[PDB]
Write a protein that binds this ligand. Structure first.
Ligand SMILES: *[C@@H]1O[C@H](CO)[C@@H](O)[C@H](O)[C@H]1NC(C)=O
Ligand SMILES: *[C@@H]1O[C@H](CO)[C@@H](O)[C@H](O)[C@H]1NC(C)=O
Ligand SMILES: [Ca+2]
Lengths: 100, 49
C-alpha cells in the first residue's frame, strides 16, 4: 500500500468520536507491513501532519509507534475543510523524491 | 402584522441553529449568522417609529 490517513480533528469530533478515531487509526496502522508506506495527516480548516514525518514513511515498528503516539496526542478544534485536506493528501501521494 | 412576521421569522431562524463542540459550526449556521442584520435593523426601525 501507500496509505495516507486523513484524520478529521475538527470541533464536531470531540468526545467519543475522537476516542474512536484514534483507536481506529491505531488499529489501521496495526495492519501495515514493512513493505507498506504510510503517513497520517489531520485537517481542520488547515491540513497538517500529525507527527514529525513530512512524507510517506515505511510502516515498520518504530515509525508505526511514532505515528500512533502522534495520533494519541491529537486534539479536536476548529471548522472542517474537506478541500484543504484532500489537497494535502493528494499532494503527499504525488511525492516521488522519497522511497515508496 | 409585518413586525409580527419578522418576529416569527427571527424565531424560526433561532430554532434553526445547531451547535458543535469546539468552535466547529455547520455550513448553514453561517447563513443564519448573516441574516441577523436585517432583523436588528427592522427592530431598530420599529423602535424609532
Ligand atoms: C503532545 O503532547 C504534549 C504533552 O501533553 C502537548 O504539550 C502537545 O501540545 C501535544 N502535541 C500537540 C500537537 O498538541
Ligand atoms: C522533490 O524534488 C524536486 C527537485 O529536487 C523539488 O522541486 C520538489 O519540490 C520536491 N518535492 C516534491 C514533493 O516534489
Ligand atoms: Ca465538522
Amino acid at each position: 500500500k501507500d496509505m495516507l490517513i486523513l484524520v478529521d480533528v475538527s470541533g464536531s469530533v470531540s468526545g467519543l468520536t475522537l476516542k474512536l478515531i484514534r483507536t481506529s487509526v491505531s488499529e489501521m496502522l496495526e495492519t501495515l507491513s514493512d513493505d507498506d508506506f504510510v503517513n497520517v495527516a489531520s485537517f481542520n480548516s488547515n491540513a497538517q501532519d500529525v507527527s514529525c514525518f513530512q512524507h510517506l514513511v515505511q510502516a515498520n515498528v518504530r515509525n508505526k509507534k511514532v505515528l500512533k503516539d502522534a495520533v494519541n496526542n491529537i486534539t479536536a478544534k476548529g471548522i472542517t475543510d474537506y478541500k484543504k485536506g484532500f489537497s494535502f493528501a493528494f499532494e503527499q501521494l504525488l511525492n516521488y523524491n522519497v522511497s515508496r | 402584522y409585518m413586525i409580527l412576521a419578522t418576529i416569527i421569522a427571527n424565531c424560526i431562524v433561532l430554532a434553526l441553529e445547531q451547535h458543535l463542540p469546539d468552535g466547529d459550526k455547520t455550513p448553514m449556521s453561517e447563513r443564519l449568522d448573516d441574516t441577523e442584520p436585517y432583523f436588528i435593523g427592522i427592530f431598530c426601525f420599529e423602535a424609532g417609529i
